[PDB]
Amino acid sequence: QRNTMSKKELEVLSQKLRALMPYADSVNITLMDDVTAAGQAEAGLKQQALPYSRRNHKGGVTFVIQGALDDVEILRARQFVDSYYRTWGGRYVQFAIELKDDWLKGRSFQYGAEGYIKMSPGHWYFPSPL
């Protein structure tokens, strides 16, 4: 669902890849669907009970796994990504697992469209709307 090649010029690619790999007798080119490459990456990421956040954009998706994960949720999330890279490649869908602590580390805040962080009982900070 992302190329515009006809039947004739796919034989040119199947012959310029055969001349590029000398041991290969013939190269077979199969057209794989695109929504089953991200629906298998979302269904595998839901069975391990991991928190995630899918970001859809044009020509590739990205699953972001952040927070303070525990010891079992790192091993279970490292065994799925390396089993997915073996079959689909890291070209279309990208996994971004990042281990970071509690943001706004011990501070009380009032979130949403008018935000302020409370540095102290008598101190206000007005950054970007938290």
Partner: protein, 65 residues
């Protein structure tokens, strides 16, 4: 209430003499322990950068001098 603001105008030279010869790090202790005494433990701690325009009270200079 009313005579205490009259005696404040009468007591500027003694407060200025006590400021010059007391300790800066010790008046700030008697100022913060007074604010912690009066208002509570959630009072903001006073630092050194009040010293330009704000003047300490007569009950903090007198023990520190």
């Amino acid at each position: 209430s009313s005579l205490s603001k009259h005696v404040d105008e009468g007591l500027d030279g003694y407060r200025d003499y006590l400021i010059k010869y007391s300790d800066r790090e010790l008046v700030q202790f008697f100022e913060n322990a007074q604010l912690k005494r009066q208002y509570g433990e959630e009072t903001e701690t006073v630092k050194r950068d009040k010293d330009e325009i704000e003047k300490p009270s007569i009950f903090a200079l007198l023990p520190a001098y």
